[PDB]
Amino acid sequence: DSFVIRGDEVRQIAPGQTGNIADYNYKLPDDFTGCVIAWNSNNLDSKVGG
Amino acid sequence: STASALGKLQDVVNQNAQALNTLVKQLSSNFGAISSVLNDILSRLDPPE
Numbered sequence: 001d002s003f004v005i006r007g008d009e010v011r012q013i014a015p016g017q018t019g020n021i022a023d024y025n026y027k028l029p030d031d032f033t034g035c036v037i038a039w040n041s042n043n044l045d046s047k048v049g050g
Numbered sequence: 051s052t053a054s055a056l057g058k059l060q061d062v063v064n065q066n067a068q069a070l071n072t073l074v075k076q077l078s079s080n081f082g083a084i085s086s087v088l089n090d091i092l093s094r095l096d097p098p099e
Binding site: 015016018030 | 097
């Protein structure tokens, strides 16, 4: 499951986490097994005009 | 007239009552947790901790 997220909320992708996206868009199970990968996308997913 | 002649049965009854009473009393103990009542710690903290 892949998407793009704001920088300050990267810590919210974890079991038992509360925030803006944690309980409104994407919530992981408490017993989730697997891995999470986060990397930068400034050079491609950012525009000078926004 | 004279009392205290039936010590064995009274002792048995007292032992049973005391054991039940202390078993009930053990509920209020903390055991190192935040509180001795489940509802308070449920409504005060989210599940993960």
